[PDB]
Amino acid sequence: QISVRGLAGVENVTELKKNFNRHLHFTLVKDRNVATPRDYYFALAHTVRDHLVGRWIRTQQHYYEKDPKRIYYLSLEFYMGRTLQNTMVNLALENACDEATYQLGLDMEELEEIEEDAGLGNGGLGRLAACFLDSMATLGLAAYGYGIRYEFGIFNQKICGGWQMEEADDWLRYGNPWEKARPEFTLPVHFYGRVEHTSQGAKWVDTQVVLAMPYDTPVPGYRNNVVNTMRLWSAKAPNDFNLNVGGYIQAVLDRNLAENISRVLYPNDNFFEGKELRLKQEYFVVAATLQDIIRRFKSSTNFDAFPDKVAIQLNDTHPSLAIPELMRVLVDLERLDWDKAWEVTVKTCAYTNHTVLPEALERWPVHLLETLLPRHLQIIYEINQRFLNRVAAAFPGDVDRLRRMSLVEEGAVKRINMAHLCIAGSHAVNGVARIHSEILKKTIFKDFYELEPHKFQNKTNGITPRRWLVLCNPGLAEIIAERIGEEYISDLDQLRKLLSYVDDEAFIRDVAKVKQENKLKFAAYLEREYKVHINPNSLFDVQVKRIHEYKRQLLNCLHVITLYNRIKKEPNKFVVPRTVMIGGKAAPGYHMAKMIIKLITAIGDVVNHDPVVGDRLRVIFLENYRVSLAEKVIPAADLSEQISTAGTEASGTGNMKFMLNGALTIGTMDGANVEMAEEAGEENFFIFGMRVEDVDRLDQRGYNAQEYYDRIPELRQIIEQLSSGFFSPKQPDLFKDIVNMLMHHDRFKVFADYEEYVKCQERVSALYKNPREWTRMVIRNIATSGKFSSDRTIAQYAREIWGVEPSRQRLPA
Numbered sequence: 148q149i150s151v152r153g154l155a156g157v158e159n160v161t162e163l164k165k166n167f168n169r170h171l172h173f174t175l176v177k178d179r180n181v182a183t184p185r186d187y188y189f190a191l192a193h194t195v196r197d198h199l200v201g202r203w204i205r206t207q208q209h210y211y212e213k214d215p216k217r218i219y220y221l222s223l224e225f226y227m228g229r230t231l232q233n234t235m236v237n238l239a240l241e242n243a244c245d246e247a248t249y250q251l252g253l254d255m256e257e258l259e260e261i262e263e264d265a266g267l268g269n270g271g272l273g274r275l276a277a278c279f280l281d282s283m284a285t286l287g288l289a290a291y292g293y294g295i296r297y298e299f300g301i302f303n304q305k306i307c308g309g310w311q312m313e314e315a316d317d318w319l320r321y322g323n324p325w326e327k328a329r330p331e332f333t334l335p336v337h338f339y340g341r342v343e344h345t346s347q348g349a350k351w352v353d354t355q356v357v358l359a360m361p362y363d364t365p366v367p368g369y370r371n372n373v374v375n376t377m378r379l380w381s382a383k384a385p386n387d388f389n390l391n392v393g394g395y396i397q398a399v400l401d402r403n404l405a406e407n408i409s410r411v412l413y414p415n416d417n418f419f420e421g422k423e424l425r426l427k428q429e430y431f432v433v434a435a436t437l438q439d440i441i442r443r444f445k446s447s448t449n450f451d452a453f454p455d456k457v458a459i460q461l462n463d464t465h466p467s468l469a470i471p472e473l474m475r476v477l478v479d480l481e482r483l484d485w486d487k488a489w490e491v492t493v494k495t496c497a498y499t500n501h502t503v504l505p506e507a508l509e510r511w512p513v514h515l516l517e518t519l520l521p522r523h524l525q526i527i528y529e530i531n532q533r534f535l536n537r538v539a540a541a542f543p544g545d546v547d548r549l550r551r552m553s554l555v556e557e558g559a560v561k562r563i564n565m566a567h568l569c570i571a572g573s574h575a576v577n578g579v580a581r582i583h584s585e586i587l588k589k590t591i592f593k594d595f596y597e598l599e600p601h602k603f604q605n606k607t608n609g610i611t612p613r614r615w616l617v618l619c620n621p622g623l624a625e626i627i628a629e630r631i632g633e634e635y636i637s638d639l640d641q642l643r644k645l646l647s648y649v650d651d652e653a654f655i656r657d658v659a660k661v662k663q664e665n666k667l668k669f670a671a672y673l674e675r676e677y678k679v680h681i682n683p684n685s686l687f688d689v690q691v692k693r694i695h696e697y698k699r700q701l702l703n704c705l706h707v708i709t710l711y712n713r714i715k716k717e718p719n720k721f722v723v724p725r726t727v728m729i730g731g732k733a734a735p736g737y738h739m740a741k742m743i744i745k746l747i748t749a750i751g752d753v754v755n756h757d758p759v760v761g762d763r764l765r766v767i768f769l770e771n772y773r774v775s776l777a778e779k780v781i782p783a784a785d786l787s788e789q790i791s792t793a794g795t796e797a798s799g800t801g802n803m804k805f806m807l808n809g810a811l812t813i814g815t816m817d818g819a820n821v822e823m824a825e826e827a828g829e830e831n832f833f834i835f836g837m838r839v840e841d842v843d844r845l846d847q848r849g850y851n852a853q854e855y856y857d858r859i860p861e862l863r864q865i866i867e868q869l870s871s872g873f874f875s876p877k878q879p880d881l882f883k884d885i886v887n888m889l890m891h892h893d894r895f896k897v898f899a900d901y902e903e904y905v906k907c908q909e910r911v912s913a914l915y916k917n918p919r920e921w922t923r924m925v926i927r928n929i930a931t932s933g934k935f936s937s938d939r940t941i942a943q944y945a946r947e948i949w950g951v952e953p954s955r956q957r958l959p960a
């Protein structure tokens with residue numbers, strides 16, 4: 148059908164069709180008379196998987212021969228989404244499979260909707276890991292993703308009476324055709340026990356053993372025949388575990404205790420909960436991974452070359468135990484001296500920070516580490532002592548620097564600061580956008596920066612143009628390719644060439660056409676799967692991301708209510724119609740975030756059924772926001788809401804997805820928004836609100852929300868409506884907590900940005916009245932979105948952190 152989806156050769160189509168029938172018969176044990184769409188999905192999945200195998204075995208054998216430096220990306224989260232379409236795209240099989248399935252009398256797009264998302268992540272940090280694996284394969288790096296195979300990923304969100312209900316994400320129920328169990332590579336992990344000191348070193352003894360079983364998932368590069376590996380550990384009890392009939396039975400049933408380690412992903416987005424189970428997960432992935440790393444290195448005695456052959460990237464502090472675990476192995480097991488072991492560790496490890504919010508930082512109580520990991524605590528104390536000696540020597544007599552920089556936090560409960568541990572034990576520390584990285588140097592890690600300025604770097608985040616353009620928006624990818632060819636898909640800087648098409652009337656028409664088709668298709672999806680009705684001619688105003696106070700979904704709510712009140716005041720006046728879509732999950736125990744969801748639905752209940760409003764304003768809450776839903780709503784959007792309080796969103800990546808797919812951005816000068824506006828030109832961006840400096844000034848003075856309430860009549864009206872029960876007639880005080888929070892304890896200064904936000908929103912509406920000028924500004928965004936490709940991000944990591952050269956050269960097919 149379309150060019151970028153590859154060739155549908157006579158011979159390829161014939162082969163696909165016969166392997167499809169072979170798998171349906173031999174693999175699924177079905178015949179065409181009983182087969183359901185799910186059976187058809189699986190036969191296709193298995194048929195496409197067959198094409199990976201040859202390339203996967205030869206990629207891995209190639210690494211064994213050439214022995215390049217290996218990159219180990221350690222993460223507790225990999226937010227993968229669906230795999231079928233992505234595999235077809237990267238293998239150039241999409242059109243062939245489309246043809247082959249059509250000839251079998253099947254609709255491939257219908258089959259693609261049957262795949263479960265691999266939802267092994269919460270949000271941004273998890274999806275970054277997924278984009279990174281794609282880019283590393285595409286750039287020909289010898290890279291491995293290492294994490295946990297959660298039986299249950301992020302929960303499915305259902306909305307019931309406006310409230311969020313959580314249900315288990317049983318994603319493995321029908322099986323996962325993409326993974327390959329490797330039980331033969333199972334490894335032991337130790338917990339608890341005690342430390343014994345001998346003539347020749349410390350020994351960790353009397354431990355409980357949990358087995359770690361790896362599952363390998365292929366990661367194909369873009370049309371380069373490279374297939375890398377994502378290895379995910381699963382927890383298994385040993386067979387002498389807990390080993391009378393009641394006693395015998397119970398001992399077998401208690402195997403569950405060990406296997407609970409890999410059962411479920413913690414659903415917290417930017418908040419730290421000090422739970423033992425979570426600590427076990429963190430050690431589990433670290434201990435199993437490091438043994439695999441060492442095994443692979445030994446199959447290349449001399450650990451001097453270890454950092455020449457190994458890089459370990461820590462995705463936040465979650466796998467921070469890699470540092471003392473590497474020390475433990477090198478000192479206790481390999482018998483290296485401390486200082487040499489430490490040199491190796493530092494040169495091997497690097498740390499990426501993803502947030503500045505204090506409540507998100509990992510601070511493990513000492514008594515937890517004492518019981519679960521007694522040897523690691525000793526190594527940590529030893530690391531701390533040697534580190535503080537260096538601080539003392541560099542800043543003599545600065546006793547307060549010593550307590551500020553300590554890995555050990557004293558107080559009610561003693562805690563270990565894992566961020567401090569990572570900085571001390573890594574040769575490189577980076578933030579995820581230029582503004583975020585500067586904030587790390589000037590505020591939270593200022594002391595560490597003064598000690599070791601050379602450690603601190605920036606690596607602005609990116610998103611893969613494969614999943615986030617070609618896969619989810621084939622229409623846009625095609626019209627771009629018509630003008631500038633296909634090479635941009637792996638070299639996104641080439642989109643700049645679209646600047647010379649900004650006054651091209653054909654191109655303007657095509658861009659606007661692709662968007663309207665995306666909007667029609669999404670409007671249909673809402674009717675079919677959710678029986679909700681929207682005007683596809685209205686402006687699609689969307690904010691999708693995790694529900695958090697810092698992200699200020701509440702500021703969006705205030706604008707929405709303002710528009711509604713303005714309409715009710717002047718019903719027969721013209722306003723640009725909007726569909727306001729807000730989606731995202733709240734962490735199960737975050738009361739305020741759950742209250743915000745209820746507020747959103749409550750506004751919709753009033754707004755969507757007011758006859759005077761008509762189809763001029765619609766408020767929709769997008770249920771169960773996840774990777775596969777993002778792939779649908781992002782191409783359909785006109786306006787991207789990126790309205791976090793300046794200084795709080797480290798980078799953001801949703802912002803980039805929208806820019807690449809033809810939405811204009813309303814946002815604050817926060818995270819990557821700053822660099823996006825810089826690339827496109829500020830005139831092509833809807834920037835409003837306090838900058839970081841303005842937030843600082845307001846804090847020095849003290850934030851008084853009352854002041855804004857007193858001086859803004861429109862804001863007063865909204866608050867009074869909330870208090871009085873306008874949006875909750877049967878529970879008049881339902882939103883008292885929200886009002887109280889806004890008036891008295893607002894950490895994120897919602898009121899302070901309200902006026903500029905509403906003002907700027909009027910400028911958006913004005914521009915949308917002029918279709919040709921809207922579209923020309925759109926073209927200016929798409930054309931400057933090149934910097935935000937994860938290929939760029941990964942090449943910077945490779946060159947400035949890992950010390951390896953990316954390559955676009957094909958491996959033989």
Ligand SMILES: O=C(Nc1ccc2ccccc2c1)C(=O)N[C@@H]1O[C@H](CO)[C@@H](O)[C@H](O)[C@H]1O
Nearest residue numbers: 271272275417418419501579796797798799800
């Ligand atoms: O901190 C994040 N997530 C988590 C996830 C689990 C956690 C568990 C315990 C404590 C903090 C946690 C933070 C996160 O997603 N941060 C986001 O990372 C993105 C990728 O770098 C950024 O774009 C985004 O700005 C940032 O908020």
